[PDB]
Amino acid sequence: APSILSTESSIIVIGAGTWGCSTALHLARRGYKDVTVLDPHPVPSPIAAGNDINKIMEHSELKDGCSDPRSAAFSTFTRAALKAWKTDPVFQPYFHETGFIISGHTPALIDHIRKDEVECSETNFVKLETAEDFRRTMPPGVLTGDFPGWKGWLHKSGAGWIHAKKAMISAFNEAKRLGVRFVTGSPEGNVVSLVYEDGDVVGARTADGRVHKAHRTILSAGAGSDSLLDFKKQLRPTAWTLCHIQMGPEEVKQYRNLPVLFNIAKGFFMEPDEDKHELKICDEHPGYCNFLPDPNRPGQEKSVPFAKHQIPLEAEARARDFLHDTMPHLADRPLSFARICWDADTPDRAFLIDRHPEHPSLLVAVGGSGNGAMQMPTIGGFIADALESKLQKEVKDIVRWRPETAVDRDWRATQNRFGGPDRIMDFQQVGEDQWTKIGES
Ligand SMILES: Cc1cc2nc3c(=O)[nH]c(=O)nc-3n(C[C@H](O)[C@H](O)[C@H](O)COP(=O)(O)OP(=O)(O)OC[C@H]3O[C@@H](n4cnc5c(N)ncnc54)[C@H](O)[C@@H]3O)c2cc1C
């Protein structure tokens, strides 16, 4: 039914974010001559979850008795990703293999980590038992806290952090040098609808009323994808929170080459960025939704993203609680920046990358599920493979279109996340005066 795919086939990519820029770059490398990317914002988009001074990268090989099909698929994604972060000239300068510490501060959290993470991994970890053990993982003056009740595990190699924002820009620049066209801005790149003819997708319509036609359309608009196609509940747009503290010009010099410090029920931080010397803290929790009436499902809810360069005050407080335990000397410092950041969870938090069974010219590439940024170097390769009907067997069935897994989906499932109230939160229940007020009077 669909037109025969060739390198001369016109291709539209909706969304110039983490996955879209990667897909554009891979398509261009494969020789596709007519690729156009649409985005309501210029790269890097302010609403792209990948637009972040840092994200965590981690790869684990699993012991045999822990390798179900879904986790084997994920290891396949991250194995490929890790290799590319270390080699692809477009991405290599932005990966910092500083290691990764996973930890918890109650017996139940520690046991969950030991049983379900550490003992399933082929990684050899260093066990951190005491506050002193924690502090010694970083240079003097960095970690100063008492880590009360904390125990953890340090993974030295195959993990660290990536400069997601610069790597995205790097992928964008290279896609462009290789001939990809980017229509980025509003209304010209703001897609409001897919375009249908004969029951197939033939392109995209933007908010200026222009119709963009293509032989293939790739939907990779992150959380925003959920309003451009009926995903049959397969996506839950969900938001996490970050804030930055601005480090001083002398103090920042100790904060170099730091392993990621992650408490699965409190949060994490990464080292200050090279440009602004800002230290980022994410407070860990199951996520905020923004539950509004589903326009197509009477009596049902649907989480709808919105952009804000503030975070709820309760999130800031969780971030400072994390700081009190680890770096109390910073716990009262003013925030220089904060924002909410949107991704979308599938029901099993595996990716969703597949051609649409009812519209063969449409490829969806969505469902980052909290783990999509570290995939940036290689995800466009899997996505391109899917477009070319050769997505490899280790992953293709795990990431397929699977609406049957989302029937009567419970939006308030915590989906293996912890922290804060240990429940899914709702922005509709956050008071208008209950946000940070960075940059205001
Ligand atoms: C706080 C937070 C921390 C995270 N930490 C990590 C981590 O440490 N490691 C990790 O691997 N992952 C992490 N993630 C997840 C990761 O950021 C996402 O999975 C990944 O960036 C998603 O990539 P994406 O391309 O699907 O979406 P995005 O990067 O959000 O890009 C989507 C793009 O689509 C565009 N768009 C939107 N709407 C429309 C429209 N109508 N038309 C056209 N275009 C459009 C947007 O402007 C945007 O540029 C984190 C996520 C959050 C929220």
Author numbering: 2 to 442
From the manuscript:
In this study, we apply a novel rational design approach to the stabilization of wild-type Amadoriase I from Aspergillus fumigatus. Using a rational in silico computational design and screening method, we have produced two forms of the deglycating enzyme Amadoriase I featuring a significantly higher thermostability compared to the WT enzyme. In particular, the introduction of disulfide bonds provide considerable stability to proteins by locking their fold in a well-defined local or global conformation.
To confirm the formation of the designed disulfide bond in the SS03 and in the SS17 mutants and to assess any possible change that such modifications may have caused to their global molecular architecture relative to the wild-type enzyme, we solved the crystal structures of these two thermostabilized species. The crystal structures of the SS03 and the SS17 mutants were determined at 2.15 and 2.85 Å resolution, respectively. Focusing on the region where the mutations were introduced, the SS03 mutant (S67C/P121C) is highly superimposable to the wild type enzyme (residues 62 to 72 and 116 to 126, RMSD = 0.842) while the SS17 variant (D295C/K303C) shows a structural rearrangement in the region from residue 290 to 308, with an RMSD of 1.657 Å. No significant variation in the geometry of the catalytic pocket can be observed between the two mutants and the wild type enzyme, demonstrating that indeed the introduction of these disulfide bonds, which is intended for thermal stabilization only, does not alter the architecture of the active site of the enzyme. For the SS03 and the SS17 species, the mutations did not significantly affect the apparent steady state parameters relative to the WT. Conversely, the SS03 mutant features a ~3 °C higher thermostability with respect to the WT. On the other hand, the SS07 is more stable in a reducing environment, further confirming the detrimental effect of the introduced disulfide bond in this species. Interestingly, the SSDM, which potentially carries both disulfide bonds of SS03 and SS17 does not display any cooperative effect relatively to the two single mutants; in fact, the measured T50 is consistent with the one obtained for the SS03 mutant, suggesting that only the C67-C121 disulfide bond may be actually formed.
